[PDB]
Amino acid sequence: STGSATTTPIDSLDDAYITPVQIGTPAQTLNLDFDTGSSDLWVFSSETTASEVDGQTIYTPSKSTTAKLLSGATWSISYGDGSSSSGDVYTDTVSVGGLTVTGQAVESAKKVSSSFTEDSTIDGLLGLAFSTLNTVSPTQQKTFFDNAKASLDSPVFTADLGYHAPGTYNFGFIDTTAYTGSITYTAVSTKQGFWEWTSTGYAVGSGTFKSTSIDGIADTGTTLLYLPATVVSAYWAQVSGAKSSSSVGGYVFPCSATLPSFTFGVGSARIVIPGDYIDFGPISTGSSSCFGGIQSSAGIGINIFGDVALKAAFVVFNGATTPTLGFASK
Ligand SMILES: Nc1nc(CCc2ccccc2)cc(=O)[nH]1
Structure with a gap:
């Protein structure tokens, strides 16, 4: 079926x-x-x-x-x-x-x-x-x-x-018509009960790729992309006027900004999140300060590839005897 x-x-x-x-x-x-x-x-x-x-x-x-x-x-x-x-x-x-x-x-x-x-x-x-x-x-x-x-x-x-x-x-x-190129599969740990995997790294905008292991979960139920503070700081540093706000509870940026893309690694493959996907709009109605879609995972204890990341990909949740995750561009 x-x-x-x-x-x-x-x-x-x-x-x-x-x-x-x-x-x-x-x-x-x-x-x-x-x-x-x-x-x-x-x-x-x-x-x-x-x-x-x-x-x-x-x-x-x-x-x-x-x-x-x-x-x-x-x-x-x-x-x-x-x-x-x-x-x-x-x-x-x-x-x-x-x-x-x-x-x-x-x-x-x-x-x-x-x-x-x-x-x-x-x-x-x-x-x-x-x-x-x-x-x-x-x-x-x-x-x-x-x-x-x-x-x-x-x-x-x-x-x-x-x-x-x-x-x-x-x-x-x-559905092989729903994505471009090939699906890259990656290992999953189920020890915490999540679709937990390890990204091979990231890039910010047109910047070079940083190879670094980022363990996190593929979570359709989380809206944003939560990554280590170092990574999130590297991203927002490319956005003029962006700052982490303790009162707001994360990075905010001028709504007039054009945001850079963010790329994450799945094995040797790369998923590119367009800058616009990272714009969560005014922090309150009528404000010219906007909320960022990439936020620090510090103190939530886990990295989370939420909708911001997943919506840039066709994502396979493979429930074989040994589960795996697949990602393709689309
Ligand atoms: N994976 C995940 N799921 C939920 C589900 C609950 C929920 C649903 C919509 C809006 C707000 C809360 C909350 C959460 O933080 N992470």
């Missing part, structure tokens, strides 16, 4: 991407944030505290003839950015772009943190990291991709995120 679904930026800055998902019988379609950096499929629901729901589409398990409460099971997650959610668990039928899993764990939110309430565009998360990170207790549950994998034509999914435009998640096949 295979599946294919379009993924859409939630706003004009590509702050996150949503993908429609069918849950239950009859289908209830929710727009979920496909997150290769976490491993819970959770949704806003009929059970979510009423004051914590503000425009999201909710899953109502009582209206699904295939929903079954998973006895005694609860979940609670806290993300890298400080947001959180928790609740109980059903198993139900879940489909993505024509691909169906029966008995998928659907984690129904009883509580969500304020950032989720405040964003009406995201109805929940669909985790695509390794199932070892799933938070369901006392019996850990499998991700959508883990459940689907055996049935897929090939045990893979791909992320093709758009810059200011729709993109695609495919399951079970590689």
Whole structure:
């Protein structure tokens, strides 16, 4: 089997991407944030505290003839950015772009943190990291991709995120028309439960390539590109007037600047992130100070190849016996 679904930026800055998902019988379609950096499929629901729901589409398990409460099971997650959610668990039928899993764990939110309430565009998360990170207790549950994998034509999914435009998640096949040149595959460690790999280095604009190992994660659920302070300083030094602001919480730059590109290495291959991808717009409405899309990973403890990086590539999440990641230009 295979599946294919379009993924859409939630706003004009590509702050996150949503993908429609069918849950239950009859289908209830929710727009979920496909997150290769976490491993819970959770949704806003009929059970979510009423004051914590503000425009999201909710899953109502009582209206699904295939929903079954998973006895005694609860979940609670806290993300890298400080947001959180928790609740109980059903198993139900879940489909993505024509691909169906029966008995998928659907984690129904009883509580969500304020950032989720405040964003009406995201109805929940669909985790695509390794199932070892799933938070369901006392019996850990499998991700959508883990459940689907055996049935897929090939045990893979791909992320093709758009810059200011729709993109695609495919399951079970590689669309050879969706990228240019070849796909370069690179080793993955699953020891932290992430798609963790090692970049071979970087370049800033037309500058020469610096060969240096950067360990990090391919994370569709993180918006920005988080890299070591030395690398991030080298980037922003090329932007006149750019400064790290402790009050804002990162590098900001004059909105009138034209930003240089940033290149990262995958083996001998190179993925080029155009300068415009790094512009996250005014820090507050009407400001002429803009927020940078490349930020220091210092004190978050891990480098993160988030959407800023991934949207410059066609990305293969290869779930073979020994997982690997592939990157191509596009
Ligand atoms: N990998 C990853 N996932 C999340 C998911 C939660 C989320 C979703 C949209 C906006 C804000 C928070 C948060 C995070 O920091 N990293």
